[PDB]
């Protein structure tokens, strides 16, 4: 369908006190490939991120309405938004447009703005919020990404394990997909800092 | 004081002067009376002759609201003709909805809603005419209600409106109107108007009567010329 | 200037609203109501200026819904307007929430309609006070009185009209004695109130008495034949 | 005093002075007269020129084949009702394919006249309308007022100095029914004589007429055919 | 909403509201402009600030397009609305017609707004009078003045604001074929036109120039002093 | 309806000015004294608090100092109610700008955007104008550090230093005298506010609680805004405490 | 359709100036923020013994953690109850969280700002005291007819507020227990209110970690021991 | 100010409209001419300064090839009416594929003038009447036609009508000189004689503007050629 038009994938995981996010860089049209330099992950501010996949237009559209309503909430209240609260914003934003729906599969991961407490979740094409404390995968290669994650996922792992874990997850999974691949961006969210690495993958 | 400059402004004594002036505007109108009895409701109207140039039947103050509902008005004539079309369009919307003729209690209530709606705001003015709404039905019988500039319904066995009022109301109280029949009501209605009006300012007039009841088969109908003149001749006995 | 339209007076008053309070008082009719243990009674002055007028054609007791009665005091022009508007609400309540509207919300919605008249300078307050009665399954008998200003509160014994000052005093004298609350004996208290104030001994057609009970939540109007029974035979 | 500001304010005698002054503006302008027999109806309109260099204003507005009207009052105020009256008559033949009855049209025009009255901010129409028409029941002469009141008359004279004109119409009213089309114009033009002073009386140039009849549709005459109509009559 | 008439007539026929509008026009700062031979030059006096204001927002000489620029004298409030919505018309005219804007075309749509604001319900006539000046096709310059009432004129040399009549007296007397001969004499005339209403102002005069195909150019303060240095 | 009570703000005086606007500037003068300074290292903002009582709390960041966006802030002197209306409209215009161009709004663009809304009520609508005067600070990509002052009539302009509210004639006079154009920076020029706020306040012994100070400076490619520590401002006043003796 | 609020020659707002004059002519109201809770005390004065006390209450809850009191025109407060409650629900739709005190009073006062601007509507004749508990921080705010909301450790309003503030300059200390703050507010209204002091006339409510809870006359009778 | 726009006077007049016709006495003197051979309209430019260009200001503009214009009083009020007058004129040919008659031109303008109102309308409606006195001439298959219009909105066929400040004595003077079959060139003579007499400034090609319409010759604006000839041929 149109969700498979531009392809792409987004993956996110949670460690013990930390969370991890990784996604492919590929941007193309159907069978034709265009450019590998596209960015599917945008910073939401301190200790919070959001991923997006599916139609690339709504990825660059819906995400722009985020910081719009986000700043208005960050200007009125002197605190940053909670990731549990931000999930309600995107679900409400998709259900104002529900009738002729945007095309995307949001992915939200971060920490409790209050302290260290991690939280992760993902949404649906129609705007249904879904809270999963293990991992979230979205994209055209989704069915291929599950088996890799669920096999290698563990409840509590240090950032060192999360490095290789989601990496090896993405690598073998994204292989078997035709419309996803060719570069990977990885985001690691720690308490006092943030780690961001680039993975070497097959160009195909 | 400036407290009478608008209807939305209340008097320091707790009165509304603009609506009271509308009642005083009715006091400038010619005298009109109506009476209900067992057979039906009888109407009458004093029609003033301003000049001979007027055609017979001109300046008609008898309005037909609906099949079973007639109306007689006293006040500014055009304000009544404008509301008459409002009442006709209202009774028409009723039958178009519920599929039968609106009863007099229902129609006089919704018209009073339109009358009082214009007394509420400052952007409009109240009606300068007080009118009577008669009806007859086999389900109800002879019914007569009265609406005023304040938009309040008043049922009456007999009533009088226009310039001379209290004098005609007392004459109606002197004789029971419920026992008499519509055939004999037009006799007294004619005799009263001759007693009400004397020649001082105005010169001549004519009697305008209306019939609703069993004799009209439950339909608003004007008085025929033969019976009207016959009842006037019996009323001329008091004049001679 | 402030004495004409509705704007804040230098003393904090509202003269357009206060001149309305004299307009309810201008109607020349005194109304009283008492909330009993098992019942709530309303007694108002029924005036018939001329014999040509008819009884059932002019009445001060209106029915908002089956279980809620209404009495009105003031210039009748504003009387019929609120009742139709109240029936547009009470009926709308059932279309939305699906049950008979309580007396609490009915007085709240009617007040909000009257509150706009005071806040919005385009319109004017209405010259009739509204006393709404009824019964609920929790608080039992409910008696409220809504002024044109929009204020309403639970009144054990309420009064209105020219004699309201003298009526309130006699209503206090009965409650000061901790008067035992029974149905018909309370109906006397509301009737004897207006009877002792004016020093008349009214005829049965000169008063209009509504009633509501726990046994009969549907509002009823006391028959004039039953009025004559409890006037003459029981004056005691 | 303070009661003359708008229409909504009522006088303590129960009179609207704006409607009263609306009737005063009608008396401020050209006097027109019209009458009907059992067959033909004629509308005699008095045309007045500001100066001799300027020509005479048009007091007659053609409505339909069976309907015509003359205007006395504020000039341009009749243009709004004109285009409305013409649109209503066209809508009658556009739907019913039938000419709208004369009594039904005036009842609809009197409605549009009364609506702006009670509503504040809308100026009442300050022009009087003398309208005539023919139907299966014969001709009709309907005179209106800025108060929206309209009557049914055998003959009526409105405007300035219409007093002596109406007195002439009342005594000769008995003849107006039995006279034919030629005698209706004659006595109709001699009725216009009383509306003007003893110096300037009547000419065929400043006086135009129109007629409607049984088999004759409403027509308008100005000078040519009016010259034999006036001449041959004693005044 | 708010619906009523604002400007109404008078027993003498003159407009109370409009005359008070043109009064506020004269209460503003003095602005001048002329139509040169091959160029156009605008200028306006500056009330002397003491070591504070920034000249970015204070500049009263703006540009509606590359072809046409403008200046204003009056209340600074209503001036910015006209400048914004006139630039919208400049882009809307190029959007509707591929050909560039015409000075006479843009000018009339400007003054037409002030006419609408006068006769519209609830609106208000502006207290500004703007000088619309630019280049037509073939390079023929045009200078037009607006009015709060909505009329627009054509002027070879013009002065607006405070003392507009006083400078106009200097114009009509000293405006000849010798005036606006060359780019230098055109600018020196604008300076001298601002020397009558200036009291110990000095350097407060700021100038602007548009040269042929090039867009409005602002003369630097030192470039202004170069032409101001010659007085006597 | 009742044109008798219609004030008709749009009517011009016989002197050719506006009734409500002229009375609006006076209402601003009754408000508290607020000043601002544009320096090389950034913008300086200081505001007096005319409300003084032992029961005051002020749980917010500051009373008369607000934050417009990441790169800009503002102060206020005037009617306190209409200030929240203008503050919200500035936050709406700035964020709607971020939608189209995905870039921070420049200082001059955000100021002229609200001033069109301010004077739109003086042009028509019949609604009363705004009696709020606002100061504007921040940084933009082109013009950099900027300081702006607004008027209730909708007029505005750039300023290197200024003062609003009470004691406007005395403060601005004291400001220019020692003001160093493009020279005296945050550190040094911060002592001038305390020096001016002590002169503008008629009550002696200027307190750090009675005043509030906030600065905005972009460092390392990131805009940094903060409200100065009252404990340090006290020591910053302790400087002025020892200034008259030495 | 036209706003009657204009600027006086001195700059004051005449319509709002008389708005507070109506607030000062009402029943006295006080409040104290101390320890983990905030107390609000009002005086309900009927016109006789014939009016039911428990039928209508001056203290009304907005949400679980927020409640409001008032002194001024009664009917004008009923409009704010519907608009404040409806605003908090529109908040719970978007952010799915209870509304904070600072966010609520902001847009609630915006309703006051709208009717002091939009034409054909008079300003409010009421002044409200805002009580809220969020994230362990007690919040006591005071709103006026003009729409300006401030922050107060303690405050007094209505009638005799000058003597009420004088009591707060002394009787109010820091580290004060909420229970002692309730009896302290009773001592503040001891001089103002005269006649018979009962538990039905005074109406008190508080908000704490457990949320906003209105006090019953039976509990108030125990709190009247002073 | 203590009065309304539609308020009637005790003598049956409108306060508003009465001052409209009272306001036009300060306008510029202009006179129309209707001749058997065509229609002629002249207007005084009334230039207040040599820097003001008399060529840019035009009080006579071309709606259709037949119909001209005239202006007096406030100039922009006429421009507002002429704009919509030229739109409906082309809307005529857009439908019927023919030129609009002189009568239908004034009928459209009379409708636009009668719509004046404030309450119970849209903000895009004209609130106050125009201070312009309109003269609409033209020549069609019916022949030369010249109409007069005032702030009231009426239109009447007339040979000549004077507008402006001098309209008092000019209209009586136009009556005396113009009679019978007098043609174009003979009309320009008596036109420039009466106009030069009443206005302060002496007759010049740039001080006034003149244009004519003929059956065979459509609306022709007189340039410096025709203007300088008729002023010396007076």
Numbering used by the authors:
A (entry chain S): 2 to 205
B (entry chain R): 6 to 245
C (entry chain L): 9 to 244
D (entry chain Q): 4 to 238
E (entry chain O): 2 to 233
F (entry chain N): 1 to 246
G (entry chain M): 7 to 232
H (entry chain P): 8 to 241
Which lines from the publication concern this structure?
We then in vitro assembled the purified human PA28αβ and bovine iCP into the intact PA28αβ-iCP immunoproteasome complex in the presence of glutaraldehyde as a cross-linker. Regarding the interaction interface between PA28αβ and iCP, our PA28αβ-iCP map revealed relatively strong pieces of density corresponding to four PA28αβ C-terminal tail insertions into the α-ring pockets of iCP, including the C termini of PA28 β3, α3, β2, and α2 inserted into, respectively, the pockets of α1/2, α2/3, α3/4, and α4/5 of iCP, and a rather weak piece of density for the C terminus of PA28β1 in the α5/6 pocket. However, we found no obvious extra density in the pockets of α6/7 and α7/1. Interestingly, PA28αβ overall displayed stronger interactions with the α3–α4 side of iCP but no binding with the opposite α6–α7 side, consistent with our observations of the slight leaning of PA28αβ towards the α3–α4 side and more intimate interactions with iCP on this side. In our PA28αβ-iCP structure, all seven activation loops of PA28αβ were resolved, with the ones interacting with α1, α3, α4, and α6 of iCP showing stronger pieces of density. In addition, we also observed conformational changes in iCP induced by PA28αβ binding, including a slight shift (up to 2.3 Å) in the reverse turn regions of the gate keepers α2/3/4 and the neighboring α5 in iCP. In contrast, in our PA28αβ-iCP map, the N termini of the α2, α3, and α4 subunits in the PA28αβ-contacting iCP α-ring appeared disordered, suggesting that the binding of the PA28αβ activator to iCP caused these regions to become more dynamic. This plasticity in these N-terminal regions may have disrupted the allosteric networks in the gate region, leading to a partially open gate in the contacting α-ring, while leaving the gate in the opposite α-ring closed.
Proteasome activity is fine-tuned as a result of the association of the proteolytic CP with diverse proteasomal activators (PAs), including PA700, PA28, and PA200, that can induce the opening of the CP gate into the central proteolytic cavity, allowing substrates to be degraded. In contrast, PA28 (also called 11S or REG in most organisms, and PA26 in Trypanosoma brucei, TbPA26) stimulates the degradation of peptides in an ATP/ubiquitin-independent manner. However, lymphoid cells and cells exposed to cytokines such as IFN-γ alternatively express three homologous subunits (β1i/LMP2, β2i/MECL-1, and β5i/LMP7), replacing the constitutive ones, in the 20S immunoproteasome (iCP) particles—with this alternative expression resulting in a change in the proteolytic activities. We determine the uncharacterized cryo-EM structures of free bovine iCP and the single- and double-capped PA28αβ-iCP and PA28αβ-iCP-PA28αβ to resolutions of 3.3, 4.1, and 4.2 Å, respectively.
